[PDB]
Scaffold this active site. Structure first.
Site, PDB file in Angstrom:
ATOM      1  N   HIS A  44       0.848  -1.334   0.065  1.00 15.60           N
ATOM      2  CA  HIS A  44      -0.229  -0.110   0.054  1.00 15.60           C
ATOM      3  C   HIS A  44       1.095   1.313   0.007  1.00 15.60           C
ATOM      4  O   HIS A  44       0.414   2.457  -0.010  1.00 15.60           O
ATOM      5  CB  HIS A  44      -0.849   0.061   1.067  1.00 15.60           C
ATOM      6  CG  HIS A  44      -0.194   0.688   2.297  1.00 15.60           C
ATOM      7  ND1 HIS A  44       0.390  -0.209   3.367  1.00 15.60           N
ATOM      8  CD2 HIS A  44       0.236   1.837   2.868  1.00 15.60           C
ATOM      9  CE1 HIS A  44       0.961   0.378   4.295  1.00 15.60           C
ATOM     10  NE2 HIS A  44       0.888   1.785   3.981  1.00 15.60           N
ATOM     11  N   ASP A  93      -0.639  -7.164   2.121  1.00 18.52           N
ATOM     12  CA  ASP A  93       0.067  -6.048   2.151  1.00 18.52           C
ATOM     13  C   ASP A  93       1.758  -6.187   2.301  1.00 18.52           C
ATOM     14  O   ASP A  93       2.405  -5.927   2.998  1.00 18.52           O
ATOM     15  CB  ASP A  93      -0.204  -5.000   3.430  1.00 18.52           C
ATOM     16  CG  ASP A  93       0.317  -3.657   3.086  1.00 18.52           C
ATOM     17  OD1 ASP A  93       0.560  -3.069   1.978  1.00 18.52           O
ATOM     18  OD2 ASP A  93      -0.007  -2.860   4.076  1.00 18.52           O
ATOM     19  N   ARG A 161      -9.499  -6.482  19.283  1.00 15.22           N
ATOM     20  CA  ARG A 161      -9.158  -5.040  19.569  1.00 15.22           C
ATOM     21  C   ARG A 161      -9.683  -4.409  17.854  1.00 15.22           C
ATOM     22  O   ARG A 161      -9.766  -3.323  17.952  1.00 15.22           O
ATOM     23  CB  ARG A 161      -7.706  -4.793  19.550  1.00 15.22           C
ATOM     24  CG  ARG A 161      -7.251  -5.434  20.802  1.00 15.22           C
ATOM     25  CD  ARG A 161      -8.177  -5.273  22.094  1.00 15.22           C
ATOM     26  NE  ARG A 161      -7.547  -5.881  23.376  1.00 15.22           N
ATOM     27  CZ  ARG A 161      -8.196  -6.004  24.531  1.00 15.22           C
ATOM     28  NH1 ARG A 161      -9.545  -5.456  24.657  1.00 15.22           N
ATOM     29  NH2 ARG A 161      -7.473  -6.689  25.411  1.00 15.22           N
ATOM     30  N   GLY A 186       4.132   6.997   8.126  1.00 11.08           N
ATOM     31  CA  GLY A 186       5.663   7.202   7.786  1.00 11.08           C
ATOM     32  C   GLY A 186       6.237   5.813   7.919  1.00 11.08           C
ATOM     33  O   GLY A 186       7.268   5.727   7.397  1.00 11.08           O
ATOM     34  N   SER A 188       5.249   2.861   7.675  1.00 14.13           N
ATOM     35  CA  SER A 188       4.827   1.673   6.571  1.00 14.13           C
ATOM     36  C   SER A 188       5.883   1.078   5.949  1.00 14.13           C
ATOM     37  O   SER A 188       6.846   1.957   5.490  1.00 14.13           O
ATOM     38  CB  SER A 188       3.796   2.339   5.721  1.00 14.13           C
ATOM     39  OG  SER A 188       2.675   2.771   6.533  1.00 14.13           O
ATOM     40  N   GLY A 189       5.946  -0.251   5.561  1.00 14.39           N
ATOM     41  CA  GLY A 189       6.911  -0.847   4.866  1.00 14.39           C
ATOM     42  C   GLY A 189       8.126  -1.067   5.901  1.00 14.39           C
ATOM     43  O   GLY A 189       9.014  -1.898   5.667  1.00 14.39           O
TER      44      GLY A 189
HETATM   45  B1  LIG Z   1       2.203   4.180   6.376  1.00 13.58           B
HETATM   46  C1  LIG Z   1       1.298   4.534   7.826  1.00 13.58           C
HETATM   47  C2  LIG Z   1       0.126   5.099   7.710  1.00 13.58           C
HETATM   48  C3  LIG Z   1      -0.846   5.023   9.148  1.00 13.58           C
HETATM   49  C4  LIG Z   1      -0.387   4.440  10.113  1.00 13.58           C
HETATM   50  C5  LIG Z   1      -1.060   4.407  11.421  1.00 13.58           C
HETATM   51  C6  LIG Z   1      -1.956   3.459  11.949  1.00 13.58           C
HETATM   52  N1  LIG Z   1      -1.008   2.212  12.371  1.00 13.58           N
HETATM   53  C7  LIG Z   1      -0.279   2.046  13.462  1.00 13.58           C
HETATM   54  N2  LIG Z   1      -0.654   2.883  14.571  1.00 13.58           N
HETATM   55  N3  LIG Z   1       0.198   1.032  13.654  1.00 13.58           N
HETATM   56  C8  LIG Z   1       0.836   3.846  10.087  1.00 13.58           C
HETATM   57  C9  LIG Z   1       1.762   3.827   8.933  1.00 13.58           C
HETATM   58  O1  LIG Z   1       3.563   5.318   6.579  1.00 13.58           O
HETATM   59  C10 LIG Z   1       3.424   5.520   5.441  1.00 13.58           C
HETATM   60  C11 LIG Z   1       2.126   5.795   4.866  1.00 13.58           C
HETATM   61  C12 LIG Z   1       2.342   5.493   3.191  1.00 13.58           C
HETATM   62  O2  LIG Z   1       0.996   5.588   2.715  1.00 13.58           O
HETATM   63  O3  LIG Z   1       1.389   4.464   5.465  1.00 13.58           O
END
Ligand SMILES: *[B@@]1(C2=[C][C]=C([C][C][N]C([N])=[N])[C]=[C]2)O[C][C]([C][O])O1
Length: 237
Positions: A44, A93, A161, A186, A188-189
């Site tokens: 994603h 993902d 949850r 940020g 993510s990945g």
């Molecule tokens: B990711 C991203 C987006 C939103 C979150 C918050 C929800 N997840 C949690 N709290 N573990 C985390 C990571 O970072 C880069 C973008 C790229 O689209 O998505």
């Protein structure tokens, strides 16, 4: 990363920062070096991306400030998204980035071993989540790579949850009942590095969750062990 601290340089050598050059250069996602020309990241993370040409992978980075117009980087030759992927929350993902050039390993940049199918009945100790992601719901990319120690939670516990979602066995969650430490926009990945008998294992890939570090809302990660066959198939020419 929420509730974490600054990492030591070279402490997470497999962590890379993936940038996009459009419209202007910026950090897009985290990722992990798993092979000389392979980065494992989240699918994603390529939403709106129609070409590998605007991508730049930087390795051996601690502070985003180290990245300037004259900083060397790896170009991306191909983006491989799981053909079953639709959206983070639905699973699958995962994505592979085939670099245009090979990574010369060193103390600052080396691969993380993937977990083995037998490492399923194994209890992972010392699991950490890292990245340059947000520090809160509405923050901004962090300069220094952040790290936070976070325990794994059973799927059954995670499912409780997220009643509105379906936490499958291809997902793995991690967090504190009371929140406080977790990945955020940020990250993510980003890799979910976990220690197993003195050896660092790539247990999960930062995928999604509800909010950031909220109580009773564990981070959800791609269960990497469930994709070792897929990874082998896609990385073997
Ligand atoms: B990711 C991203 C987006 C939103 C979150 C918050 C929800 N997840 C949690 N709290 N573990 C985390 C990571 O970072 C880069 C973008 C790229 O689209 O998505």
């Amino acid at each position: 990363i929420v509730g974490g601290t600054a990492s030591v340089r070279g402490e997470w050598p497999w962590q890379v920062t993936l940038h996009t050059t459009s419209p202007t250069q910026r950090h897009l996602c985290g990722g992990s070096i798993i092979g000389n020309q392979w980065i494992l990241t989240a699918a994603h993370c390529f939403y709106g991306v129609e070409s590998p040409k605007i991508l730049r992978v930087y390795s051996g980075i601690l502070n985003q400030a180290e990245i300037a117009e004259d900083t060397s980087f790896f170009g991306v030759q191909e983006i491989i998204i799981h053909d079953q992927y639709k959206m983070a929350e639905s699973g699958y993902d995962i994505a592979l980035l085939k670099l245009e050039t090979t990574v010369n390993y060193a103390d600052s940049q080396r691969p993380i071993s993937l977990p083995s199918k037998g490492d399923r009945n194994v209890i992972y100790t010392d699991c950490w989540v890292t990245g340059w992601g947000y520090r809160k719901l509405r923050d901004k990319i962090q300069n220094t790579l952040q790290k936070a120690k976070i325990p794994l939670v059973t799927n059954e516990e995670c499912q409780k949850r997220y009643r509105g979602h379906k936490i499958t066995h291809k997902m793995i969650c991690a967090g504190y009942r009371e929140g406080g430490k977790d990945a955020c926009k940020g990250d993510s990945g980003g890799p979910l590095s976990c220690k197993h008998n003195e050896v660092w294992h790539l247990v999960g890939i930062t995928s999604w969750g509800e909010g950031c570090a909220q109580r009773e809302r564990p981070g959800v990660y791609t269960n990497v062990v469930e994709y070792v066959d897929w990874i082998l198939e896609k990385t073997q020419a």
